[PDB]
Protein backbone atom coordinates (compact mmCIF):
# COMPACT_ATOMS: atom_id res chain seq x y z
CA UNK A 1 0.00 0.00 0.00
CA UNK A 2 0.86 3.65 0.53
CA UNK A 3 -0.42 5.87 3.30
CA UNK A 4 -0.78 9.54 2.50
CA UNK A 5 -0.53 11.87 5.46
CA UNK A 6 -0.82 15.67 5.75
CA UNK A 7 2.66 17.20 6.22
CA UNK A 8 1.64 19.64 8.94
CA UNK A 9 -1.17 20.51 11.35
CA UNK A 10 -1.31 23.63 13.53
CA UNK A 11 -3.62 23.96 16.54
CA UNK A 12 -3.98 26.28 19.55
CA UNK A 13 -3.91 24.80 23.09
CA UNK A 14 -7.10 23.50 24.71
CA UNK A 15 -8.65 22.57 21.36
CA UNK A 16 -9.10 19.41 19.30
CA UNK A 17 -6.83 18.27 16.46
CA UNK A 18 -7.40 15.51 13.92
CA UNK A 19 -4.71 13.84 11.80
CA UNK A 20 -5.80 11.96 8.69
CA UNK A 21 -3.94 8.91 7.41
CA UNK A 22 -5.40 8.09 4.01
CA UNK A 23 -5.36 4.80 2.15
CA UNK A 24 -7.43 2.30 0.17
CA UNK A 25 -9.04 -0.98 1.32
CA UNK A 26 -8.37 0.02 4.95
CA UNK A 27 -11.46 -2.12 5.56
CA UNK A 28 -10.53 -4.87 7.98
CA UNK A 29 -7.05 -3.47 8.55
CA UNK A 30 -6.43 -1.51 11.75
CA UNK A 31 -4.09 1.50 11.56
CA UNK A 32 -1.64 2.09 14.42
CA UNK A 33 -0.52 5.56 15.48
CA UNK A 34 2.90 6.52 16.85
CA UNK A 35 3.96 9.64 18.71
CA UNK A 36 7.54 10.82 18.29
CA UNK A 37 8.68 13.85 20.24
CA UNK A 38 11.75 15.60 18.74
CA UNK A 39 15.03 13.85 19.46
CA UNK A 40 13.30 10.85 21.04
CA UNK A 41 12.27 7.36 20.05
CA UNK A 42 8.62 7.01 18.99
CA UNK A 43 6.11 5.41 21.36
CA UNK A 44 2.87 3.64 20.51
CA UNK A 45 -0.34 5.18 21.84
CA UNK A 46 -7.68 9.73 27.52
CA UNK A 47 -7.79 12.48 24.91
CA UNK A 48 -6.22 10.26 22.28
CA UNK A 49 -8.88 8.46 20.24
CA UNK A 50 -8.86 6.86 16.79
CA UNK A 51 -11.24 6.19 13.92
CA UNK A 52 -11.44 4.51 10.52
CA UNK A 53 -13.75 5.48 7.66
CA UNK A 54 -12.65 2.43 5.69
CA UNK A 55 -10.79 4.82 3.42
CA UNK A 56 -9.53 7.28 6.05
CA UNK A 57 -8.17 6.62 9.54
CA UNK A 58 -8.06 9.58 11.93
CA UNK A 59 -6.18 10.25 15.16
CA UNK A 60 -8.00 12.72 17.40
CA UNK A 61 -6.48 14.71 20.25
CA UNK A 62 -9.01 16.58 22.40
CA UNK A 63 -7.80 19.38 24.72
CA UNK A 64 -4.26 19.64 23.33
CA UNK A 65 -1.39 20.62 25.65
CA UNK A 66 2.27 21.28 24.85
CA UNK A 67 3.58 17.81 25.64
CA UNK A 68 1.38 16.61 22.80
CA UNK A 69 3.60 18.36 20.25
CA UNK A 70 5.42 15.77 18.13
CA UNK A 71 5.56 13.96 14.81
CA UNK A 72 2.75 11.46 14.46
CA UNK A 73 3.10 8.49 12.11
CA UNK A 74 0.47 5.98 11.06
CA UNK A 75 1.27 2.42 9.97
CA UNK A 76 -0.41 -0.80 8.80
CA UNK A 77 0.51 -4.19 7.35
CA UNK A 78 -0.08 -5.62 3.88
CA UNK A 79 -0.88 -9.27 4.59
CA UNK A 80 -0.51 -10.16 0.91
CA UNK A 81 3.16 -9.14 0.74
CA UNK A 82 3.96 -9.14 4.49
CA UNK A 83 5.40 -5.62 4.34
CA UNK A 84 4.91 -3.00 7.08
CA UNK A 85 4.04 0.41 5.64
CA UNK A 86 4.43 3.76 7.44
CA UNK A 87 2.98 7.22 6.80
CA UNK A 88 4.85 10.31 5.64
CA UNK A 89 4.54 12.03 9.01
CA UNK A 90 2.79 15.05 10.49
CA UNK A 91 4.54 17.83 12.40
CA UNK A 92 1.93 18.91 14.91
CA UNK A 93 2.56 22.49 15.98
CA UNK A 94 0.77 23.82 19.05
CA UNK A 95 0.70 27.61 18.75
CA UNK A 96 1.65 28.44 22.30
CA UNK A 97 3.94 31.36 21.49
CA UNK A 98 3.70 34.95 20.22
CA UNK A 99 5.56 36.44 17.24
CA UNK A 100 9.16 37.47 17.93
CA UNK A 101 12.16 38.94 16.16
CA UNK A 102 15.60 37.50 15.43
CA UNK A 103 18.70 38.82 17.19
CA UNK A 104 21.38 39.11 14.54
CA UNK A 105 25.02 39.37 15.59
CA UNK A 106 27.75 39.70 12.97
CA UNK A 107 31.41 39.12 13.84
CA UNK A 108 34.56 39.98 11.86
CA UNK A 109 37.48 37.54 11.16
CA UNK A 110 39.91 37.01 14.04
CA UNK A 111 42.98 38.41 12.20
CA UNK A 112 44.76 35.08 12.89
CA UNK A 113 42.34 33.55 10.44
CA UNK A 114 43.83 35.86 7.81
CA UNK A 115 47.23 34.76 9.14
CA UNK A 116 46.18 31.27 8.05
CA UNK A 117 44.91 32.82 4.80
CA UNK A 118 41.14 32.51 5.27
CA UNK A 119 38.05 34.68 5.70
CA UNK A 120 34.93 33.50 7.48
CA UNK A 121 32.06 35.77 8.48
CA UNK A 122 29.65 34.64 11.17
CA UNK A 123 26.09 35.82 11.39
CA UNK A 124 24.31 34.59 14.52
CA UNK A 125 20.52 34.49 14.62
CA UNK A 126 18.74 33.76 17.89
CA UNK A 127 15.41 34.24 19.63
CA UNK A 128 13.19 34.07 16.55
CA UNK A 129 9.73 32.61 15.95
CA UNK A 130 7.85 31.32 13.85
CA UNK A 131 10.72 29.09 12.80
CA UNK A 132 11.93 30.04 9.35
CA UNK A 133 14.28 32.70 8.01
CA UNK A 134 15.60 33.58 4.57
CA UNK A 135 19.17 34.69 5.19
CA UNK A 136 21.00 36.53 2.40
CA UNK A 137 24.58 37.80 2.25
CA UNK A 138 25.91 40.87 0.45
CA UNK A 139 29.35 42.32 -0.35
CA UNK A 140 29.26 46.11 -0.69
CA UNK A 141 25.52 46.22 -1.48
CA UNK A 142 25.90 43.41 -4.03
CA UNK A 143 24.34 39.94 -3.49
CA UNK A 144 26.66 37.03 -2.63
CA UNK A 145 25.47 33.48 -3.29
CA UNK A 146 28.87 31.80 -3.04
CA UNK A 147 30.35 29.94 -0.07
CA UNK A 148 27.27 30.29 2.11
CA UNK A 149 26.58 27.84 4.90
CA UNK A 150 23.34 28.01 6.87
CA UNK A 151 21.55 25.78 9.33
CA UNK A 152 18.13 24.38 10.05
CA UNK A 153 16.28 26.49 12.62
CA UNK A 154 16.87 24.83 15.98
CA UNK A 155 14.83 25.01 19.15
CA UNK A 156 16.43 26.62 22.19
CA UNK A 157 15.92 25.51 25.79
CA UNK A 158 13.93 28.72 26.19
CA UNK A 159 11.61 27.50 23.44
CA UNK A 160 12.70 29.87 20.68
CA UNK A 161 14.56 28.90 17.52
CA UNK A 162 18.13 29.82 16.63
CA UNK A 163 20.30 29.51 13.53
CA UNK A 164 23.70 30.59 12.26
CA UNK A 165 25.26 31.29 8.88
CA UNK A 166 28.89 31.37 7.83
CA UNK A 167 30.46 33.07 4.84
CA UNK A 168 33.45 31.17 3.48
CA UNK A 169 35.63 33.53 1.45
CA UNK A 170 39.25 34.67 0.97
CA UNK A 171 41.24 37.43 2.75
CA UNK A 172 41.89 38.80 -0.73
CA UNK A 173 38.16 39.47 -1.13
CA UNK A 174 37.87 40.69 2.47
CA UNK A 175 39.07 44.31 2.49
CA UNK A 176 38.15 44.71 -1.18
CA UNK A 177 26.91 43.08 5.31
CA UNK A 178 24.48 40.46 6.76
CA UNK A 179 20.73 40.63 5.74
CA UNK A 180 18.26 38.38 7.59
CA UNK A 181 14.64 38.16 6.54
CA UNK A 182 11.80 37.12 8.81
CA UNK A 183 8.22 37.70 7.64
CA UNK A 184 9.19 40.66 5.44
CA UNK A 185 10.82 42.41 8.40
CA UNK A 186 14.45 42.42 7.18
CA UNK A 187 17.29 42.90 9.69
CA UNK A 188 20.77 44.14 8.69
CA UNK A 189 24.44 44.37 9.80
CA UNK A 190 27.86 45.73 8.85
CA UNK A 191 31.12 44.70 7.20
CA UNK A 192 34.17 46.94 7.02
CA UNK A 193 37.97 46.81 7.48
Amino acid sequence: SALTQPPSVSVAPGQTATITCGGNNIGRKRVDWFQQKPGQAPVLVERFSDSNSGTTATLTISRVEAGDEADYYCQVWDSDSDHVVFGGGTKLTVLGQPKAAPSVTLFPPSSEELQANKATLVCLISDFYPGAVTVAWKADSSPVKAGVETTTPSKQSNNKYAASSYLSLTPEQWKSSCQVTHEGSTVEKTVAP
Partner: peptide, 19 residues
Protein backbone atom coordinates in the same frame (compact mmCIF):
# COMPACT_ATOMS: atom_id res chain seq x y z
CA UNK B 1 26.47 32.20 27.44
CA UNK B 2 24.81 30.94 24.28
CA UNK B 3 26.37 28.07 22.35
CA UNK B 4 24.94 27.72 18.87
CA UNK B 5 24.31 24.41 17.10
CA UNK B 6 26.85 23.28 14.51
CA UNK B 7 26.64 23.59 10.73
CA UNK B 8 27.68 20.68 8.49
CA UNK B 9 29.61 22.08 5.51
CA UNK B 10 29.92 20.79 1.93
CA UNK B 11 33.27 19.31 2.98
CA UNK B 12 31.79 16.98 5.57
CA UNK B 13 33.31 18.96 8.43
CA UNK B 14 31.32 20.68 11.19
CA UNK B 15 31.46 24.26 12.47
CA UNK B 16 29.95 26.21 15.35
CA UNK B 17 30.22 29.48 17.24
CA UNK B 18 29.44 30.31 20.88
CA UNK B 19 28.75 33.88 22.00
Amino acid sequence: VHTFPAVLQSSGLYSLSSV
